[PDB]
Amino acid sequence: DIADLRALLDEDEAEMSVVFSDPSQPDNPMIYVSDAFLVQTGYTLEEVLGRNCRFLQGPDTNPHAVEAIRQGLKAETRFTIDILNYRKDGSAFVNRLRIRPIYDPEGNLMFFAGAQNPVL
Amino acid sequence: DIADLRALLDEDEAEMSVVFSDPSQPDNPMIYVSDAFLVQTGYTLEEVLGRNCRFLQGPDTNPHAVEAIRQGLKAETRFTIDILNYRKDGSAFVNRLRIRPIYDPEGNLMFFAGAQNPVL
Ligand SMILES: Cc1cc2nc3c(=O)[nH]c(=O)nc-3n(C[C@H](O)[C@H](O)[C@H](O)CO)c2cc1C
Ligand SMILES: Cc1cc2nc3c(=O)[nH]c(=O)nc-3n(C[C@H](O)[C@H](O)[C@H](O)CO)c2cc1C
């Protein structure tokens, strides 16, 4: 039996590229990605599960935006940032990335949810 | 935002004493317990979250049944066992305990679900 992680998605997130990471595992890997995420980024499931989502960054991604996300994660707060991201074929898009922390009933950080939206 | 862990319950488990543990944390602690669990066992939420469910065992609990559960957990398989358990007031009941593993999309063990049923 597999956890239905999507049961923890918000209504906005249902048609989207959305992912969950597990910060209690080494390197905060993605443990779930939606099919829209895989379609927009050009990857298969095998290529992305268990990896940190850093692989969407590329040669012209701003390193301060990357550090901003890292700090935002440490803060355990809701945040949104526009960051240049790339697909497997190397094509680039501005990603409006929204991240929020999700807690267990004890109030311990359990997952991060991330939603990607290409800015048009 | 708190994960709705009960979204991962089976239909049988809805009216029951049911709990989830996190085996990736030290001592495989309960991260969720239903109100029926707290009512049947005589505890408050603060008294049980973050603890291993071993505290339901007591003076006449059979140590081989305890080891059977431990091995069943290591096996990552569905199992049921009748074990003598106790409430906070020291009263005892035969618990028909059913445990199953729950996996993430990668196929890694994520949680155990446990359902308690007093045998009448
Ligand atoms: C749930 C979640 C989703 C993320 N999604 C993206 C993303 O879409 N693009 C990106 O560049 N970084 C993303 N990151 C950031 C990346 O995984 C890493 O945290 C940063 O590179 C800072 O170390 C995400 C992080 C988390 C926790
Ligand atoms: C999800 C879950 C529920 C459990 N529920 C009970 C229980 O109701 N009574 C009990 O004696 N042990 C229970 N245990 C067993 C206990 O926590 C521990 O695993 C055993 O004592 C073997 O170490 C449970 C274990 C898990 C993982």
Numbering used by the authors:
A (entry chain A), B (entry chain A): 20 to 139
What is the paper's account of this structure, in its own sentences?
Monoclinic crystals of the DsLOV protein were obtained in the dark, which diffracted to a resolution of 1.5 Å. In addition, a noncanonical structural element designated as the N-cap is present that includes a N-terminal turn (residues 20–23), helix (A´α, residues 24–27) and a connecting loop (28–35). The most probable higher-order assembly proposed by PISA analysis is a dimer, where the N-terminal A´α helix is part of the dimer interface that is unique amongst LOV protein structures. The buried surface area of ~950 Å2 involves a set of interchain interactions between charged residues (D20-OD2…NH1-R119´, 3.4 Å) (residues in italics with prime refer to those from the symmetry equivalent molecule), hydrogen bonds (D20-O…N-Y122´, 2.7 Å, A22-N…O-Y122´, 2.8 Å) and several hydrophobic interactions between residues in the N-terminal cap (including helix A´α) and the β-scaffold of the opposite subunit (Hβ and Iβ). Surprisingly, the chromophore bound in the DsLOV structure is RBF and not FMN; where both are identical except for the terminal phosphate group that is absent in RBF. We suspect that the FMN bound to the DsLOV protein in solution got hydrolyzed to RBF during the crystallization time period of several weeks in acidic conditions. Mainly, residues in the 310 Eα-helix (N71, R73, Q76), Hβ-strand (N104, N114), and Iβ strand (Q135) constitute most of the hydrogen bonding interactions with the RBF molecule. The double occupancy of M49 is indicative of structural flexibility of the respective residue in the dark.
Light, oxygen, voltage (LOV) domains are widely distributed in plants, algae, fungi, bacteria, and represent the photo-responsive domains of various blue-light photoreceptor proteins. Blue-light absorption triggers the formation of a transient adduct between the FMN-C4a atom and the sulfur atom of a strictly conserved cysteine residue in the LOV domain active site. Here, we report on the identification of an unusual short LOV protein DsLOV from the marine phototrophic α-proteobacterium Dinoroseobacter shibae DFL12T. Our data suggest that photopigment synthesis in D. shibae is primarily controlled by blue-light with the short LOV photoreceptor DsLOV acting as a key regulator.
